[PDB]
From a paper:
PXR is a nuclear receptor that can be activated by diverse compounds to elevate metabolism, negatively impacting drug efficacy and safety. As a xenobiotic sensor, PXR is activated by structurally diverse compounds and plays a major role in drug metabolism and drug-drug interactions by regulating transcription of genes encoding drug metabolizing enzymes, drug conjugating enzymes, and drug transporters. Here, we report structurally related PXR-selective agonists and antagonists and their corresponding co-crystal structures to describe mechanisms of antagonism and selectivity. Structural and computational approaches show that antagonists induce PXR conformational changes incompatible with transcriptional coactivator recruitment.
It should be noted that SJPYT-278 is a racemic mixture, where the (S) and (R) enantiomers were individually synthesized as SJPYT-312 and SJPYT-313, respectively. The electron density in PXR LBD complexed with the racemic SJPYT-278 mixture indicates the presence of both (R) and (S) enantiomers, likely because they have similar PXR LBD binding potency. The SJPYT-312 complex allowed visualization specifically of the (S) enantiomer. Agonistic and antagonistic activities were evaluated using a luciferase reporter under the control of a PXR-responsive CYP3A4 promoter, and as predicted, analogs with the 4-methoxy (SJPYT-326 and SJPYT-328) are agonists, and all compounds lacking the 4-methoxy (SJPYT-278, SJPYT-312, SJPYT-313, SJPYT-327, SJPYT-330, and SJPYT-331) are antagonists. Like SJPYT-310, region B of all analogs engages both the π-trap and the leucine cage, and the triazole moiety is hydrogen bonded with Q285. Like SJPYT-310, all compounds reposition F251 and the α12 residues L428 and F429. The antagonists SJPYT-312, SJPYT-331, and SJPYT-278 lack the region A 4-methoxy group and cannot effectively engage the α12 cleft. Furthermore, all antagonists consistently lose PXR L428 contact with the SRC-1 LXXLL residue L690, while the interaction is maintained by agonists. Therefore, we performed MD simulations of PXR LBD bound to agonists (SJPYT-326 and SJPYT-328) or antagonists (SJPYT-312 and SJPYT-331). While α12 of agonist-bound PXR LBD remains in the crystallographically determined inward active conformation, α12 of antagonist-bound PXR LBD moves outward to a position overlapping with the SRC-1 peptide binding site.
Residue numbers in the entry:
A (entry chain B): 142 to 178, 195 to 231, 234 to 309, 316 to 431, 445 to 461
B (entry chain A): 142 to 178, 194 to 230, 234 to 310, 318 to 431, 445 to 459
Write the structure that this text describes.
């Protein structure tokens, strides 16, 4: 059905996903939590966060449950950001390990490996979040941790993206191929090997198109490849929107972890020491 | 009305209660919380104890947020023990200060003060908890903290709080219950048996007189005897749960240093912490 390299290409991506995606978040610990007790600069920031209002649930090995309901909109809308920054950083660290396992990624120059991950970090993080997202309950089920949302919501692009993508009912192979196509974006800022990364991206897209033809005869999956490519384009647009929105919040309320600071621009390898160090460390 | 000495008795008890009862729990900080992670017959008795009064904890925040802790189901039954040990220790400190403000209590020998507090600590604590208990929601409202019961009256402690709240007692009747319970002449280790009994009788007479003077005559003709019956039932619950606490401590230590003295884990030589608090 698939060519020998296509079969090996999917097997490597699926193996990398298994080795680097902590779906139960069993190794996510020592994270911050909400404590137990210039007009437009502050207004426009709040206008977006209301759509992303979530309640946190922390289940334990003994069966107990901690549940955090967020405060209502009235500096109280930034109570969950230190936790989300710790969670995002943990997810990105798994994303970094995902790229290190891919052979086509290791052979790139070290600065291109930094540039590619810097542009696809948010996109690969939301793709993984979609696999743990529950469309019915509106909850991201992250093992011990759960994030439950609190029409006017779908107006937010990130929310509409997760519902549209979950509605496609993608296989694990299609998800990990989306991650590869997003990661190997030749037109990211700072990329040097534009041609090599572009050639790699094209082979992943062909492999995705071929895989869909071999496993989706159903009419519900008509034009699924073109739908996926459109979603990846939309996710890249959402990346630019949220990355700039995040910088505004950091400007008013510092919350980014040291690794997240490198991702935002707050020698290439000299200003990305943590990312450079993580790219040299092995699994 | 009441005699001037009876009025001064209530005025001093109310003054002590005002100075020593943090009704809003504003100073109850730095407490432990459940984390985010033959001996058979010993554990057999322990499980039967903890599963009787399982509660869920709620934490309202200054910003309006709410933390809520649901307990597990049947070494998992020990998750709320450190928090309650912190809560009981804080409550008893206010109980100790309550007795120190009473002049009739300071004039007692230091050993009798230890014996009385040792036997009335649990009873005076549940009486104070009853005033912050909501019968409708089944929740003890301790300011920022709330303890909600989990889906009862079969348990005596549970029916006690509902029956006592049903009486709708005044502040003066509550603080008189505390005095009658504190000045129990038949506590273990009490020496001044006659003096404490005479004091308890004066508190009881004052309580009976207060009810006759501030309540409708026929509707509350047995309200005093209802109160005495509740105090009798509460003293039985004391020995039952204090024995229950000794079992749990034997298998799983959780009691704070002050609680250890309260349980038996020279009367002043084995109650040095309690002795120090009575001196200051
Ligand atoms: C599915 C979306 C994720 C998350 C999981 C349930 O949903 C949220 C829920 C509630 C909230 C608030 C409003 C209550 C705080 C936020 C979020 N979402 C983030 O916290 C988030 N998601 N991705 N990133 C991110 C990561 C990055 O690389 C490390 C670079 C740039 C990034 O943002 C441009 C971040 C910071
Ligand atoms: C009814 C109101 C109390 C409390 C508030 C909701 O209900 C509980 C709920 C759950 C639990 C567990 C089972 C989950 C731990 C326990 C308790 N109850 C105690 O934690 C308690 N209440 N009083 N005392 C006490 C005090 C003392 O000196 C002041 C001496 C000996 C004492 O115990 C014999 C204690 C230790």
């Amino acid at each position: 059905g698939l060519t020998e390299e296509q079969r090996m290409m999917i097997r490597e991506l699926m193996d990398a996903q298994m080795k680097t995606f902590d779906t139960t978040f069993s190794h996510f610990k020592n994270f911050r939590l909400p404590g137990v007790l210039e007009a437009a600069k502050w207004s426009q920031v709040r206008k977006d966060l209301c759509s992303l209002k979530v309640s946190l649930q922390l289940r334990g090995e003994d069966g107990s449950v901690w549940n955090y309901k967020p405060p209502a909109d009235s500096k109280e809308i930034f109570s969950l950001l230190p936790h989300m920054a710790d969670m995002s950083t943990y997810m990105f660290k798994g994303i970094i390990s995902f790229a290190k396992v891919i052979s086509y990624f290791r052979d790139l120059p070290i600065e291109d490996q930094i540039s590619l991950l810097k542009g696809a970090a948010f996109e690969l993080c939301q793709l993984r979040f979609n696999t743990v997202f529950n469309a019915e309950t509106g909850t991201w089920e992250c093992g011990r941790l759960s994030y439950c949302l609190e029409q006017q919501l779908l107006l937010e692009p990130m929310l509409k993206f997760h519902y549209m993508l979950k509605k496609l009912q993608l296989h694990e192979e299609e998800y990990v191929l989306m991650q590869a196509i997003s990661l190997f974006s030749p037109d990211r800022p700072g990329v040097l090997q534009h041609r090599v990364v572009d050639q790699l991206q094209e082979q992943f897209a062909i492999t995705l198109k071929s895989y869909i033809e071999c496993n989706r005869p159903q009419p519900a999956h008509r034009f699924l490849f073109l739908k996926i490519m459109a979603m990846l384009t939309e996710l890249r647009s959402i990346n630019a929107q949220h990355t700039q929105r995040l910088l505004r919040i950091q400007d008013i309320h510092p919350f980014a972890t040291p690794l997240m600071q490198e991702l935002f621009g707050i020698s290439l390898t000299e200003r990305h020491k943590i990312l450079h160090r993580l790219l040299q460390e092995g699994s």
